[PDB]
Subunit: 132 residues, 4 copies
């Protein structure tokens, strides 16, 4: 019932935590409809121009997004995502991704995620459309 | 010709692409403004629904995109892009990403990528915008 | 029944035709899941830099899209749209918008629209996500 | 100060903006990187569901966007953008589009626009990318 819903919440949280662990992502701040997580770029994530590969950035943002869904028990997947890359993230940068619900409908939602560096400059903007 | 140059560029890039090699991406087709790459979904890449993670799918699309927009010999990177996820990728699924130039100016370009599984079903649609960053490729 | 569905088709077509009329849009070619329509930019559509305003371009593309939905009886609205503007459309250009279904799900779809000028250069690319 | 300059720019542009005037757009707030504009949905703008047309909604968002990204005094145009439609706009609805800078480099910028109706419900979310085209505004 209620207890199945609670179980699903806890299950979605365990899964999100396992991906975060495996990516080296830490929760810094989290509350209703938002989450701020951090990650350090390591030399293992560099593309040929020595910056963070777009797929790690996309995961870091996906994980922040999952945590923002999960702050309110609203487990969802992304159905679409738009991303502006403004500056590269280099090895050793500490990247902070904030995700924030902007609209939550009956079946779908829109979430914005901003990734910034340790100089507080914007590395990337995402807007995602979610489903569930 | 243009296709031979496109493949030389792609061989140069792939030879030091550890993300592509780590994910098992192979390149199967190359022409100027055009690339087709391939990857098998292994269990390691799955979320809680036994479905491929977005970042792996994004990475596949971004790889066909990097090849297609670097194929003319001018180093270029993504400034922006959009992805629609249409169907899950399940373990064992073989996924083919095809990237095709829609516009290429002196500095900027637009490239459409489609990811299709072995049943010929669309998994995902991506559209990427590139920016040349100066000089020749890595 | 069937005849209600047929009536709705014909009704959606009349509406799309009235918007096209009011925008000066002509059908050039149309078939299952695609439509190619044209429009001339008039001096009444210019912004301050003397090019077509983005909202006329958006309408021209919306109308091509409606006609592509309607080619197969699949009346829909756009829920999201992404647009790259590559070159302006100037007064007197004849702009051709092609719309093409790329995916059609149970409730939703994706359509691509390209607008080109009379020199066959690309003026704008749209990708739309549709609903119905 | 910065806001006074922002409003001078906006008065200069609006004074010859016939699309804004034709659609009844008014400007109500201006600061550097920031603009709020307003419009009432009349019957003339409705589709077959008695709902505002996308192009009118797009035009409203693009107007707040043009104001916000021209507010620093450097002529700039949209190179790309994306819109999510969330709720219909019905006749009589008063719609407010607020545009806020997320990034502004020397040449390019990103601006987020939200359209809200008189019940404070979101109608639409738009994100636009701008490109400066040289010199001062029209």
């Amino acid at each position: 019932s209620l207890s199945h819903k609670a179980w699903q919440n806890a299950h979605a949280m365990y899964e999100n935590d396992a991906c975060a662990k495996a990516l080296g992502i830490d929760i810094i701040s989290m509350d209703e409809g938002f989450a701020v997580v951090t990650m350090t770029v390591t030399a293992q994530m560099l593309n040929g121009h020595q910056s963070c590969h777009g797929g790690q950035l996309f995961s870091l943002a996906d994980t922040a997004f999952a945590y923002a869904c999960n702050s309110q028990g609203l487990a969802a997947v992304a159905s679409a995502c738009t991303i502006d890359f403004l500056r590269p993230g280099f090895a050793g940068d500490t990247l902070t991704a904030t995700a924030q619900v902007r609209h939550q409908g009956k079946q779908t939602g829109v979430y914005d995620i901003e990734i910034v560096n340790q100089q507080q400059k914007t590395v990337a903007l995402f807007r995602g459309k979610s489903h569930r």
